């Protein structure tokens, strides 16, 4: 029994944490194999950060402008090349502590572990979303760029974050491991505003069968409603729409606990439209959208 | 600012240490540190044992031999076997290579520490915990859970509090410091037990209170203060738990960023509670929480 946001073990991740330095910027990077991935920003100075040209920035430098460190020991980069907003350095070492890995381009409503870093030390864990508007509501402070979000599937690290930026919201922008952004932001020093967020509604749902799982019930009832007439609602109230696909997805949940997806969606509906009443559920006063269908199962059998 | 989540610290110093401890078709999870492994005692029961266990009798029917211990599938020889009050602590011929800088610590009510789940000793996740007024903590844990253990990491340094054992009739979870001693009165047998009624941390309120002034968010703040016991006593009657001296003694950061003194908060609290919120909220929120301790505060704000 219970529910709580659990991340993945960060162990695999944690091993492969460095710190990169060019000039007097300092963020951390990701060492896999033989090769260094870090925010291609480690090489700007305050005066670049603005308008940086990158390709011009990046020429600018050799190897030896670049100082990598693993704990107290110094790998040497051998090479160097950008790959969008991606900096990667080859070293002379290989890091045997690399994991099985994948790079994956998550999808929007998945979620992921983040593994905050500050000086190429780990922080801390906790489980985020990719949201629909492509920001993350990440715990971010300065020098966590670099800091990486991630999956794992048997032995298999999926790599799916970089960090790289907090909006004027407080939210968090970053790209995937080849370094294309989430979203429509930018690597430089601007005020960035995000698309209007909306709920992952497959989410929520999910989350209300933890709620029956875990004996929270006052929201059910008798009825049901249709898939588009839900949707309508859900449109209405800045839900995503819920797809057959997600159904679908739902349906090990709706097994285990007897109520229809369509019976669940119904029970949403009336949430939306009448609010919770100061009521909770599974202890919050919102309708909590981070958690995905998968991670319900992993956590409620 | 960016809200406050339930951060947990990163597990690898933990995953390193984990283990299976097997007698018969029983596995537990176990703790490998130097030399020893350390596991919940009911690894020796067989279903007929739990109701009542006499652990004493059990063991002595048991040699090193009948305890199978495994990091993955690799078995570690032991060669030695105790109990201390709720743990089985089995000596074997490997130091664990992965042994942390590491130390036993007794946690407080309020404190909150990261749970890594295992099963048959492979990490499932990590998540944040807070022990709760009544010696419970709001794990989430399922069957094979047990042996998974707590801890807080402090400059490389693993402070292990807590190791798993039981889950109460109403869905929060029991367990033991790392010397075997049970949170609360709590025993280790197959039985419905009932905790305390439980209350609310008052401490972690009050930091989640200067977490807000923090940010900019200080409407509650009131122009008076009150003495502790007059608080205590206040608390009570909205089932807050009385705070103590540690508890005003680690408010003192906070107070200090602030320059809010926590006999001042303390009657800024009182007022919410005497008063209610009103329609207002604090942080974004109508609920006040209280599983974020002052150092969780310090750690998220900096
Ligand atoms: C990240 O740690 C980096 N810091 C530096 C410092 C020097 C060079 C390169 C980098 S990357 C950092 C993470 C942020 C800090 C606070 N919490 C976070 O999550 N990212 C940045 O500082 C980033 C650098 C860009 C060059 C990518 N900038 C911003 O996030 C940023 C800039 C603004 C802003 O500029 C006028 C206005 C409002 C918001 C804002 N965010
Ligand atoms: C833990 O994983 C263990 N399982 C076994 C199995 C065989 C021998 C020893 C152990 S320890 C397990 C974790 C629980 C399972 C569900 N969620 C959890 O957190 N602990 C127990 O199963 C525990 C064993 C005791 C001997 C300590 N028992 C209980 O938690 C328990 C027993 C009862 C009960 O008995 C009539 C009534 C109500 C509640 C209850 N909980």
Not at 82 to 97: E, G, I, R, S, Y
Not at 115 to 134: E, H, I, K, T
Request: glycine share 8%; hydrophobic share 35%; proline share 4%.
């Amino acid at each position: 029994s219970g529910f709580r946001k659990m991340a993945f073990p960060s162990g695999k991740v944690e091993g492969c944490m460095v710190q990169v330095t060019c000039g007097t910027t300092t963020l951390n990077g990701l060492w896999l194999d033989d090769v260094v991935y870090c925010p291609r920003h480690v090489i700007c100075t305050s005066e670049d950060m603005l308008n940086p040209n990158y390709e011009d920035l990046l020429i600018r430098k050799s190897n030896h402008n670049f100082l990598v460190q693993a704990g107290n020991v110094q790998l040497r980069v051998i090479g160097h090349s950008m790959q969008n907003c991606v900096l990667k350095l080859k070293v002379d070492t290989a890091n045997p502590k690399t994991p099985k890995y994948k790079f994956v381009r998550i999808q929007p409503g998945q979620t992921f572990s983040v593994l905050a870093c500050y000086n190429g030390s780990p922080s801390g864990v906790y489980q985020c979303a990719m949201r629909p508007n492509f920001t993350i509501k990440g715990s971010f402070l300065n020098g966590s760029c670099g800091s990486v979000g991630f999956n794992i599937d048997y032995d298999c690290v999926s790599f799916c974050y970089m960090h790289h930026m907090e909006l004027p919201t407080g939210v968090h922008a970053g790209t995937d491991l080849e370094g294309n952004f989430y979203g429509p932001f930018v690597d430089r020093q601007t005020a960035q505003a995000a698309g209007t967020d909306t709920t992952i509604t497959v989410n929520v749902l999910a989350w209300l069968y933890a709620a029956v799982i875990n004996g929270d019930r006052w929201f059910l009832n008798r009825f049901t409603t249709t898939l588009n007439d839900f949707n309508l609602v859900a449109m209405k109230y800045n839900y995503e729409p819920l797809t057959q696909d997600h159904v679908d997805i739902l349906g090990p949940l709706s097994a285990q606990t007897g109520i229809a997806v369509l019976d669940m969606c119904a029970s949403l509906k009336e949430l939306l439209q009448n609010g919770m009443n100061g009521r909770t559920i599974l202890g919050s006063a919102l309708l909590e959208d981070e958690f995905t269908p998968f991670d319900v199962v992993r956590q409620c059998s």
